[PDB]
Design a protein around this ligand. Structure first.
Ligand SMILES: O=C(C[C@H](C(=O)O)C1CCCCC1)Nc1ccc2ccc(-c3nc(-c4ccccc4)cs3)cc2n1
Ligand SMILES: [Cl-]
Ligand SMILES: [Cl-]
Ligand SMILES: [Mg+2]
Ligand SMILES: [Mg+2]
Ligand SMILES: [Mg+2]
Ligand SMILES: [Mg+2]
Lengths: 233, 125, 222, 196, 204, 211, 195, 226, 195, 196
């Protein structure tokens, strides 16, 4: 049993017709202090998977190393490591889920909430969540922390059920994700303007975008707001 | 200070009269005429706007007053006494009825409450 | 302090027929007031004509099911591909649950299938391993809403024959699979109205001598 | 919250952020923490929004009644009324208030009233959760008798850093200028102050 | 410990066609111990009916209180109180004890003598009104009653059909509650006739 | 829960109720609170269901192994002791189990009470659970050793009924057992609702209740 | 205190109350009468927290005696029981409630009927053919449920009461030092000196 | 609960959902969360239901008396001030979280108020358990110079977000529009997107199914003449 | 359990132990023998937490019986009491101590003397002419202090023991359901079947 | 405690105060918080003195053994050993360590290891109770590729302010310069830095 120290906020994601999108800001908070501003919380595994992590950053760095070691280990005595016997998103997720549930069962959890986004061998989209309790679930949209409360409602307007996935394009899905990140910047006190976004497509592969910023923000209306009720000046 | 008049100012005289009430009725007699007529599908109340000066804006002085959405009042006698009775009548309709039953009081019960206030000014210290 | 347990909501229902059995459950997964998934399967085909659902804390439920599926696999290896009877599976599950008497699987588990005489069977478990064979059992969030309705409409409790005035009970006539599915759908539609954790979808697994069939029905998403 | 008040040559300027939080959720991102209690006596509020609003409302009432009887009150008098409420009700309040005002006789003055209900007259004051991160910057960069433009830059730069490090602070930077010329409201948006 | 579940009991009310129904169990207990099988929880003030679940001392006290208030209402207004008006009186009276409440779950049922419209309403212990069209539930088996009522109920039932629906809702809900049962009563109410029926149920 | 068991001339009677509760909610109307260990041994159940089932089905394993090793049936005394020794290992760990081991051996009919503390008591009559006080009243005033099998079965049945009526956490149905030297005999499941009305009429008891 | 029982038969009400009083680990008295005569045909037994019991009982007694003198009339058992209930319901929401449970046995001279009322410290009133407070009912109600008839004689009521006390003496862990038994009927209140 | 408030060109609009809960259980599927303080001043409330209604009726009663005393139409700032001072005094023990809106001779106004006594001003606000789902919509679609029709849409879309995504919110959408120079229009059940589907079976019983012991006529009439 | 008494007279040791066993609010048994014969001339009575008492007593019994067989010799009461004390002193610092108090009554055949040892759960041993555990001594020691002589006969010891039990029955709040009395002398151990 | 490490053109400089407290009592006013784990790899310690000493001793042992087998370790390698101890024993430790070192290949590097056991490579780092007050100052005044003299002034000015506002910080300002030229120790006394 511990408590999280340096933390990362929301991770948001959604499925679209040819793949998945996942995003997360670049902040490492130390309570109310916005301590670290250059933290990457999306970690690619090969060219078909991206693991997005929230919660304790020290535990994230530990998971990051487990995944790096998983790639090394899979290549051992494996001539098809870059082909048929390469790591799949489902393999990577089940491994993490096994680790998370084992750690909670020893009362020494990895204080995280994880989303594994990727595309399988057969082109199927993969999107599943796992957390410090070993709890797992899948949905067309997935988000952690504040993203669950604010991002999912916006992303579910695009993909409300399974049948909406083929009707959703990558431009629409990316637009929705970027809008959601702006909303979280408006309303989450532990968020930052700077973020990373990753797209895993079954045709165009893995596109990893860094140093993105929230833009097109509305603040002008603030000038007209005066006092808290009766004040006019 | 302190209100040291804790005794009645209205008392029975040897003949059984309550002087201050009789004298109050005499003040009402000197007052401007007001009337009320009940119809089958309504009631009307009326009075004269006796303006004290032509420079005065008599629209600002309301002799006929709304007590509830379905109850109105008019008077004859001393205007200031009426004004404060209307204030109390409006309030008692809320405190002793609407805040309890969620609806406005019936005419007879609001009248009963106003009457009680006027009776107490006839016996209290 | 770290709390190793959680509540993922959900509600399940098992009914045993004369020569069939059903195990139903909603597909909504939740934490507190948020929805995690509108479709997260909760009732599983475990092989050997046995269906299972571990309702409560999803992490423990997935672990138990995963372990039981594994126990079926090793039963075949160890005993010459013998079919695991429903009564044998029930007893096995008791021992899986009691292996954690002091750090329990936070789930109420139900299995369904056919007994060795071909009749419908449902077995019901508590988190620590007490189990018993039953005819009707609702488990989970809205269990208290559903079970009284099943006592009334399946076992005809408090129902008497008109004219006798309480002297003669209503006779316990057997129900068809179509009749049972109606009671299941109405149970979940009523639960969905009055319980916030119930909704989104309903998945039913029907077990007969022919095998395991699935049926899905939408529920309100509010 | 990040709030400050700074005296300069022509008077005094108050400054504040616009973030109000309930835990990590931002309940209001365009809050007005610069509150008027008299024509040229304003306050910056920190702590419980309920407590600081209730106090400032009562103070505004006291100074309105003071003015009706005795004429325009001093900034010191306003700070005393704040203090009396904050000190006598210290067990049931969580209020950190900075009082700032302009007289023609006394010119610009600043009084800070922290949690206990004590009063401290200063050349400038900083308060709120975000103030901790700018004690060093403000001490190094503050000068007496600055110009209006210099003072605006000082507050803008200071609160910019407070906002940068404090999650409880953010949004726009509001400012109120108090001089003989009158009362001027200013506002500075994220795209302006973040690039400083 | 929990005052709202020491004595146990339930109340349910339903609307029908030109009629209403209200029913209650008869149990009173001290937690696990059954004390009385004749503790009726439904009272009437003229033609307005009131069912009360929860702490038995408060049930008894509130009945005596609403009898007090309705008797005075009648002397002054020169007419019997109506259900809509009584509902507001119950809410007002409960909220006046906002920080020291009566641990009860009241249920009003009746027909307006002028409009002929059926009326039911429920309250929390603090006075919040729930003016439902269909049904109202209260007690230690309210979850059970919600399940029965939501599935058995259909609108515009006739008095003799409504009787069967509400009786079965109560009986089967009570048989899944340890703290309810030991008898049951059902009131069937029409504009100018009221029938009261004691049900036969298991006594365990 | 209400369970009882008593020795008499013609063996031992065992009677239990059938209710299970989760707070105020009745989670089960009909649970079996007697475990058939072997054809000559029974065990009642009170406390945690899981603990009673697990440890007594495990006692059966051990009583069966005894028979294979020694070619003889285990005594009631020895079986009760094996069970009490299992409880003694998880001493303090939080188990909740109250049971009466009923059987017939060389010494005649046997009855032992065993609980989670490791307590082990021999006696002619026992009763456990939330309703045991109500059952003891009926038993103490009507019990004799000279009891016939017919009357004894009724006593244990009527005693459970007394508890099912008053105790809120007791009810559902009554399960009866009679243990002879030739083994135990099940005497059926009796709904309390139906049984109550029947007993009231035939016996004249429960005058306070209207029917 | 501990044990108080009540039974209403054909023509009388019988109250049985324990004799023990305990301070710390020592039984100070084994002949304590836990009862007060409220009026010539109304008796109240009581049990609860130390001190509160007698104070409450005597306070009720004083009020009923005051009523009797003022009106030259005896209140019905029902009227007395309602007065007592209200005082307890009033008390439970006080700064320091009176932790007292009571049984009220009375003979109504108007209706020519015995009446037994059970009231707990919360103000929970119920009219019963037989009643008890605390755990007393856990041991005795099964016997009363079985043997009780409404047409029982006073002698039969006493015999059924003896059986209840015998069961209590067998299965209760506490020694309550026997009971004082009192009968309330048309002729008034009398004590059974041999029990 | 999900409640919102949105300002527009010539007025203000508020909206709310219709579910009231007791834990996981739904007590009322069609609750009315929109309250009237005065004819053109309406408030929506979240938190403790008895408290939001009680504090609203009390201030509305005192506002009515104030309006009669002053011969003027009630102002929103008056209701705001009277509410916050009442709530502050009870230090959060009255669990009323409100969105207050209305029009008066001064113009159109929109405020929020929390249980402890703090007030806020805004062009768009949201309160309750579904406030985050609603605010996500409002932050995505709100703009300056909205029309009446655009604002009603935004408001009901914000409520829907709460209905679908928040378990504490559900059923229908209520709306009230307060435009300058007009009567306020209260649109009860403006949207009805959660109607229950037909049941598979009828559970109407045969007459005589229930066992009965005694029957009796209840005398509800008064004591009769002769 | 509750009550255990011991008295050493001229030529014997007498142990008296209560018969009651209580679970929850119900007395399950009123004929329980709270004692074990460790050897032909050594008897141990016991009282403490449920379960632990019998388990400990039987464990001690097994060890002494094992010693007797191995050496074909009976250990002296002193030797047995020391072995028991060590086991309790060992137990008190264990993960879960055995909450058991004992009296050991034995007749030493070598010295031709009766001996009574009192040992509590901590391992506190004392040799005494008379002893008790728990609250028993609070009621009985004043009588024993007054009446006890070391030259008392067995019959006189029983009479003084009856007086102790009578005083307990009068002033204790708990009903312990009488006592089983056993005598330990040169001829061995026997039970007094009428007491 | 106020500690910092700053990279510059020629390498890296570590800086620290010298105050150790037991509550409000100053147990040591001339503490050396700049600790050597290898020739040109040093650390700044904050938190429990017992924990940070025990850790740095173990690290020094690990790097001495590393050097005997594999030659001079990297600054990254040293930070990893620190991290492994701080992460795996996070339940029983209270240590906030900044690691700084000079290579010829990698030049000056700085790694900060806060409470949880996470690692963060940075251009400069600040830590300790007094660091909170200089987040604003340090962010505004830090530049990359400063000279040695500029970097010394930056640390001196920064820690001067940290000491000024933090009661847990004070005494002298110690500094350690890590370059190709070697290892230089510096010290600055109160009369020098207080007047800045
Ligand atoms: O023994 C008790 C409760 C205690 C009692 O009444 O004295 C109470 C005292 C008061 C505090 C609460 C506990 N309950 C028993 C006893 C025997 C039991 C035997 C079998 C069962 C089975 N329960 C399922 C099952 C149930 C629910 C869901 C799934 C499976 C199967 S078997 C449950 C049993 N429960
Ligand atoms: Cl504010
Ligand atoms: Cl040190
Ligand atoms: Mg029962
Ligand atoms: Mg919802
Ligand atoms: Mg000792
Ligand atoms: Mg210092």
């Amino acid at each position: 049993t511990q408590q999280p120290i340096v933390t990362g906020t929301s991770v948001i994601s959604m499925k679209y017709d040819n793949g998945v999108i996942i995003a997360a800001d670049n902040l490492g908070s130390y309570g109310s202090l916005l301590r670290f501003n250059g933290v990457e919380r999306l970690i690619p595994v090969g060219d078909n998977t991206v693991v997005g992590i929230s919660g304790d950053i020290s535990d994230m760095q530990h998971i990051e190393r487990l995944l790096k070691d998983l790639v090394t280990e899979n290549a051992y005595d494996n001539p098809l490591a870059d082909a048929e016997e390469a790591l799949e998103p489902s393999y990577i997720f089940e491994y993490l889920a096994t680790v998370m549930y084992q750690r909670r069962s020893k009362m020494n959890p990895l204080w995280n909430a994880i989303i594994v986004a990727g595309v399988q061998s057969n082109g199927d989209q993969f999107l599943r969540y796992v957390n410090l309790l070993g709890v797992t679930y899948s949905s067309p949209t997935l988000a952690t922390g504040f993203g669950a409360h604010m991002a999912n409602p916006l992303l579910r307007k695009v993909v409300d059920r399974e049948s909406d996935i083929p009707k959703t394009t990558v431009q629409v899905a990316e637009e929705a994700i970027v809008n959601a990140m702006r909303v979280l910047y408006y309303r989450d006190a532990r968020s930052s303007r700077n973020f990373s976004l990753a797209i895993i497509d079954k045709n165009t592969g893995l596109t990893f975008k860094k140093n993105l910023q929230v833009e097109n923000m509305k603040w002008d209306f603030a000038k007209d707001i005066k006092g808290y009720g009766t004040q006019k000046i | 200070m302190t209100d040291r008049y804790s005794f009645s100012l209205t008392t029975f005289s040897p003949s059984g009269k309550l002087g201050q009430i009789d004298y109050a009725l005499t003040a009402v007699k000197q007052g401007v005429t007001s009337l009320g007529i009940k119809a089958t599908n309504g009631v009307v109340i009326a009075t004269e706007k006796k303006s004290s000066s032509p420079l005065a804006m008599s629209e600002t002085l309301s002799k006929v007053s709304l007590l509830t959405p379905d109850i109105g009042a008019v008077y004859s006698g001393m205007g200031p006494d009426y004004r404060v009775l209307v204030d109390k009548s409006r309030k008692v309709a809320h405190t002793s009825y609407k805040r309890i039953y969620g609806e406005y009081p019936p005419t007879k019960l609001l009248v009963s409450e106003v009457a009680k206030i006027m009776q107490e000014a006839t016996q209290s210290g | 302090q770290f709390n190793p347990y959680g509540d993922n909501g959900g509600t399940i229902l098992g009914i045993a027929g004369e020569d069939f059995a059903v195990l139903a459950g909603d597909t909504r997964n939740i934490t507190d007031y948020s929805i995690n998934s509108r479709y997260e399967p909760k009732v599983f085909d475990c092989g050997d004509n046995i269906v299972m659902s571990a309702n409560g804390f999803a992490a423990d439920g997935d672990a138990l099911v995963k372990r039981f599926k594994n126990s079926v696999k090793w039963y075949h290896f160890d005993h010459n591909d013998k079919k695991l009877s429903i009564n044998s599976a029930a007893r096995n599950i008791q021992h899986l649950l009691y292996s954690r008497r002091f750090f329990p699987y936070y789930v109420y588990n139900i299995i369904a299938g056919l007994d060795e005489d071909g009749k419908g069977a449902v077995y019901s478990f508590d988190p620590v391993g007490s189990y018993q064979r039953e005819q009707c059992r609702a488990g989970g969030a809205a269990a208290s809403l559903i079970m009284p309705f099943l006592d009334n409409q399946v076992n005809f409790k408090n129902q008497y024959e008109p004219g006798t005035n309480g002297k003669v009970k209503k006779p316990l006539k057997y129900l068809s699979v179509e009749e049972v599915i109606k009671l299941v759908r109405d149970s979940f539609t009523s639960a969905t109205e009055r319980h916030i954790q119930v909704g989104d979808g309903l998945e039913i697994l029907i077990v007969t001598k022919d095998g395991v069939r699935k049926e899905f029905y939408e529920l309100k998403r509010d | 919250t990040s709030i400050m008040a700074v005296t300069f040559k022509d008077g005094v300027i108050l400054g504040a952020d616009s973030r109000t939080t309930t835990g990590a959720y931002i309940a209001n991102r365009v809050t007005d923490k610069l509150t008027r209690v008299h024509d040229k006596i304003w306050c910056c509020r920190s702590g419980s929004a309920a407590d600081t609003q209730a106090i400032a409302d009562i103070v505004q009432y006291h100074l309105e009644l003071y003015t009706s009887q005795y004429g325009t009150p001093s900034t010191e008098t306003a700070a005393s009324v704040f203090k009396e409420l904050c000190y006598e009700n210290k067990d049931n309040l969580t209020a950190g208030i900075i009082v700032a005002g302009y007289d023609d006789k006394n010119k610009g003055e600043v009084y800070t009233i922290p949690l206990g209900g004590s009063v401290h007259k200063l050349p400038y004051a900083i308060a709120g959760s975000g103030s901790t991160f700018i004690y060093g910057y403000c001490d190094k960069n503050f000068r007496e008798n600055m110009s209006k433009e210099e003072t605006v830059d000082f507050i803008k730069h200071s609160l910019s850093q407070a906002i940068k490090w404090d999650g409880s602070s953010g949004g726009v930077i509001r400012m109120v200028v108090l001089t003989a010329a009158g009362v001027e409201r200013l506002i500075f948006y994220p795209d302006e102050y973040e690039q400083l | 410990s929990d005052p709202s579940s020491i004595n146990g009991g339930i109340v349910v009310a339903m609307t029908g066609k030109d009629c209403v129904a209200i029913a209650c169990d008869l149990r009173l207990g001290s937690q696990s111990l059954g004390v009385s099988n004749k503790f009726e929880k439904i009272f009437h003030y003229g033609h307005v009916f009131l069912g009360i679940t929860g702490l038995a001392t408060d049930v008894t006290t509130l009945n005596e209180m609403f009898r007090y208030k309705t008797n005075l209402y009648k002397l002054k207004e020169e007419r019997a109180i109506e259900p809509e008006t009584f509902t507001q009186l119950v809410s007002s009276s409960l909220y006046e004890r906002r920080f020291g409440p009566y641990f009860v779950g009241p249920v009003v049922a009746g027909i307006n003598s002028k409009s002929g419209k059926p009326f039911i309403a429920g309250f929390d212990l603090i006075g919040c009104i729930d003016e439902a069209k269909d049904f109202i539930v209260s007690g230690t088996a309210s979850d059970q009653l919600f399940g029965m009522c939501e599935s058995l109920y259909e609108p515009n039932l006739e008095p003799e059909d409504l009787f069967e629906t509400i009786s079965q809702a109560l009986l089967n809900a009570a048989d899944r509650d340890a703290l309810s049962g030991w008898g049951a009563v059902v009131y069937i109410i029409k504009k100018d006739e009221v029938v009261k029926r004691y049900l036969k149920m298991r006594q365990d | 829960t209400t369970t009882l068991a008593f020795k008499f001339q013609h063996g031992v009677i065992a009677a239990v109720d059938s209710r299970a509760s989760a707070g105020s909610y009745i989670s089960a109307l009909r649970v079996n609170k007697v475990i058939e260990i072997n054809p000559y041994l029974l065990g009642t159940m009170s406390g945690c269901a899981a603990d009673c089932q697990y440890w007594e089905r495990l006692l059966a394993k051990e009583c069966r192994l005894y028979y294979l090793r020694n070619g003889e049936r285990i005594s009631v005394s020895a079986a009760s002791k094996l069970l009490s020794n299992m409880m003694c290992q998880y001493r303090g760990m939080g188990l909740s189990m109250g049971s009466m081991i009923c059987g017939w051996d060389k010494k005649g009919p046997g009855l032992y009470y065993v609980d989670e503390h490791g307590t082990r008591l021999s006696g002619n009559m026992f009763s456990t659970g939330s309703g045991n006080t109500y059952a003891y009243g009926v038993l103490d005033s009507n019990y004799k050793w000279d009891l016939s099998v017919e009357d004894a079965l009724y006593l244990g049945k009527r005693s459970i009924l007394a508890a099912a009526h008053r105790d809120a956490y007791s009810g559902g149905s009554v399960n009866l057992y009679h243990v002879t030297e030739d083994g135990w005999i099940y005497h059926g499941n009796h709904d309390v609702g139906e049984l109550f009305w029947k007993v009231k009429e035939e016996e004249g008891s429960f005058n306070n209740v209207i029917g | 205190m501990d044990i108080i029982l009540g039974i209403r038969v054909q023509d009388s009400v019988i109250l049985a109350s324990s004799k023990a009083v305990t301070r710390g680990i020592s039984v100070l008295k084994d002949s304590d009468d836990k009862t007060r005569q409220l009026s010539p045909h109304t008796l109240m037994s009581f049990a609860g927290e130390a001190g509160d019991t007698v104070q409450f009982a005597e306070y009720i007694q004083a009020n009923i005696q005051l009523y009797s003198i003022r009106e030259d009339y005896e209140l019905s058992p029902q009227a007395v029981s309602s007065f007592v209930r209200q005082e307890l319901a009033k008390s439970i929401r006080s700064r320091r409630p009176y932790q007292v449970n009571v049984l009220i046995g009375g003979y109504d001279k108007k209706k020519n009927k015995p009446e037994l009322y059970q009231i707990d410290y919360l103000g929970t009133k119920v009219e019963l053919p037989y009643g008890a407070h605390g755990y007393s009912g856990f041991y005795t109600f099964s016997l009363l449920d079985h043997h009780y008839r409404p047409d029982m004689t006073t002698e039969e009521g006493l015999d059924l009461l003896k059986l209840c006390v015998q069961e209590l003496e067998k299965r209760m862990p506490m020694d309550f030092k026997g009971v004082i038994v009192k009968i309330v009927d048309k002729d008034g209140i009398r004590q059974v000196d041999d029990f | 609960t999900t409640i919102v408030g949105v300002k527009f060109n010539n007025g203000v609009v508020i909206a709310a959902d219709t579910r009231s809960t007791q834990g996981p259980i739904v007590a009322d599927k069609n609750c009315a969360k929109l309250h009237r303080i005065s004819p053109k001043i309406w408030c929506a409330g979240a938190g403790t239901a008895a408290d939001t209604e009680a504090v609203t009726q009390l201030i509305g009663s005192n506002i009515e008396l104030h309006s009669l005393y002053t011969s003027r139409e009630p102002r929103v700032v008056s209701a705001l001030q009277m509410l916050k001072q009442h709530l502050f005094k009870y230090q959060g023990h009255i669990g009323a979280y409100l969105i207050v809106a209305g029009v008066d001779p001064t113009g159109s106004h929109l405020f929020s108020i929390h249980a402890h006594g703090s007030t806020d001003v805004g062009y768009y606000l949201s309160l309750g358990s579904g406030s985050l789902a609603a605010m996500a919509v409002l932050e995505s679609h709100w703009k300056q110079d909205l029309t009446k029709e655009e604002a009603i849409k935004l408001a009901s879309d914000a409520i829907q977000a709460g209905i679908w995504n928040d378990l504490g919110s559900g059923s229908n959408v209520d709306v009230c529009v307060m435009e300058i120079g007009k009567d306020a229009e209260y649109l009860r059940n403006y949207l009805t997107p959660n109607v229950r589907e037909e049941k598979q079976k009828s559970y109407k019983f045969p007459r005589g199914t229930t066992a009965v012991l005694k029957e009796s006529i209840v005398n509800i009439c008064d004591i009769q003449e002769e």
